[PDB]
Amino acid sequence: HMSFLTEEEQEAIMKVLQRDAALKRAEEERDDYDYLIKFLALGDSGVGKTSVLYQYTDGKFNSKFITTVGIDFREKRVVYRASGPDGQRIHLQLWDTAGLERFRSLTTAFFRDAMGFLLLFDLTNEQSFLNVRNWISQLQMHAYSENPDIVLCGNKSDLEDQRVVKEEEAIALAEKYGIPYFETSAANGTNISQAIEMLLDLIMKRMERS
Amino acid sequence: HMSFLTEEEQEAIMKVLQRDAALKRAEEEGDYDYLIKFLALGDSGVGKTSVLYQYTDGKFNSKFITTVGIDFREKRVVYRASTGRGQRIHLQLWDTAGLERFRSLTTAFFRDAMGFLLLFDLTNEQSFLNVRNWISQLQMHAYSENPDIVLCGNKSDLEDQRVVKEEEAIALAEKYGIPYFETSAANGTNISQAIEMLLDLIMKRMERS
Ligand SMILES: Nc1nc2c(ncn2[C@@H]2O[C@H](COP(=O)(O)OP(=O)(O)NP(=O)(O)O)[C@@H](O)[C@H]2O)c(=O)[nH]1
Ligand SMILES: Nc1nc2c(ncn2[C@@H]2O[C@H](COP(=O)(O)OP(=O)(O)NP(=O)(O)O)[C@@H](O)[C@H]2O)c(=O)[nH]1
Ligand SMILES: [Mg+2]
Ligand SMILES: [Mg+2]
């Protein structure tokens, strides 16, 4: 399989890298917040990574499929409270990777910048669920820490008539790898905040203990 | 200069990334004091892979094997401040492809670099004229405002084919305030010096933090 990038696509990717470098250089000055926290969404093409992040940052949802050109990221400013009987201002950088195999090496090159991973499959696509095992072993091999923080999302929960992944099977996978699991919908917002706030909690607690 | 990627090339790149992650995970788990990373860049053919290989192994291959996107080498060295006490340094030497079809992938590794070894080929005028473009790329894409850069005019052993005048290269390096070495990966001339100068810049910038 040969893949290609047009000039326009190379241009778009370089712009993402340019925005990223500008963001990191501005943290080197005022590191208007307390932490820059970075995580990365991954999983098969079409499962809803881009929609999930857009629902989270803007509360909006597009029906039209615009497959991601390699890599992108979004930003959000949130307040984090140490979960338990406890406010830190968090600048979130949300990396959005393409799922298509043609972008595997480019997207894996950004794992080094990720403190945690939002891993998606599509509740209506059984193969995307069967590939979760491969995504996890790719994360074991390519993450830059031992035992990376991962939150698993079974997305498109609003499409009940098309659901093919049984809750029991997804639960069994989450227990086997010891990772949290949420069933989400980027269309209506269900559990989006909850899944991403849990990932942020995992990251913040791991830093405090280090 | 159409941008394409094959499956076998992705596999090779993914192996480098796998090696990289293993190295980073092993530093977090010693035998040295710092993991110091820098990155070689410049036009295809100027000798980036050759320079790093001469430095780490004292060897040189005549045959051109263009780099498949990205690679890195390693070396364990002792660094002395300016003297000072010997610090054990684990070097990770990133090697980027110069061809445009790898530009996005290679630029994605600037973030891991504490310093840059920028090469042109003393026998290739185009590679010298592209130096200012590479410096501009580093300003736009490095993850600090004034990245440390050492400029190498490589292939100094090819005297009859030399076309870049030393005065012009010295003046270009002085304009940007970067050190300049004329190197040969074939016979080793100035390789150690240029890379030790880059390491010095990085270690001294850290000490001031
Ligand atoms: N009904 C419904 N549709 C969704 C949901 N999430 C995504 N979609 C739809 O599914 C399609 C794929 O979504 P998209 O976010 O682009 O997926 P992706 O994971 O980013 N794909 P890629 O990796 O190729 O960039 C789009 O048509 C989008 O509208 C969801 O929760 N519910
Ligand atoms: N005579 C001589 N040949 C050199 C020198 N440095 C590199 N070469 C030769 O020039 C060719 C290109 O060298 P190479 O290190 O592969 O260049 P590169 O910068 O890594 N190219 P790429 O970006 O495509 O990977 C090879 O044939 C190599 O042997 C040098 O100092 N002297
Ligand atoms: Mg997408
Ligand atoms: Mg090379």
Author numbering:
A (entry chain A): -37 to -7, 5 to 59, 65 to 188
B (entry chain C): -37 to -9, 4 to 56, 62 to 188
Paper excerpt:
Structure-guided inhibitor development can be a powerful tool in targeting GTPases;21 however, in line with previous reports we were unable to crystallise monomeric Rab27A without substantial mutation to the PPI interface. We therefore designed a novel Rab27A construct to allow crystallisation whilst leaving the WF-binding pocket free for ligand binding. The C-terminus of Slp2a SHD1 (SFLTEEEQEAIMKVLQRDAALKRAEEER (residues 5–32)) was linked to the N-terminus of Rab27A via a flexible poly glycine-serine linker. The unstructured C-terminal hypervariable region of Rab27A was truncated and a Q78L mutation was introduced in the nucleotide binding pocket to promote adoption of the active GTP-bound conformation. We termed this class of constructs fusion-Rab27A (fRab27A); variants bearing C123S and C188S mutations (fRab27A), as well as single mutants specified by the presence of the wild-type cysteine at position 123 (fRab27A-C123) or 188 (fRab27A-C188), could be purified to homogeneity and form protein crystals which diffract to high resolution (C123S, C188S, 2.32 Å, Table S1†). fRab27A adopted a closely similar conformation to the Rab27A-Slp2a co-crystal structure, with average root-mean-square deviation (RMSD) of 0.554 Å. Importantly, the structure leaves the WF-binding pocket unoccupied, as designed. Covalent ligands are increasingly used to target challenging proteins. fRab27A contains two cysteine residues (C123 and C188) in close proximity to the WF-binding pocket, which are mutated to serine in crystal structures. The novel fusion construct presented here provides a new tool for structure-guided drug discovery efforts against Rab27A.
Rab27A and Rab27B are secretory Rabs with well-characterised roles in transport and docking of secretory vesicles (exosomes) at the plasma membrane. Rab27A promotes the growth and invasion of multiple cancer types such as breast, lung and pancreatic, by enhancing secretion of chemokines, metalloproteases and exosomes. Reported co-crystal structures show that several effectors of Rab27A interact with the Rab27A SF4 pocket (‘WF-binding pocket’) via a conserved tryptophan–phenylalanine (WF) dipeptide motif. To obtain structural insight into the ligandability of this pocket, a novel construct was designed fusing Rab27A to part of an effector protein (fRab27A), allowing crystallisation of Rab27A in high throughput.
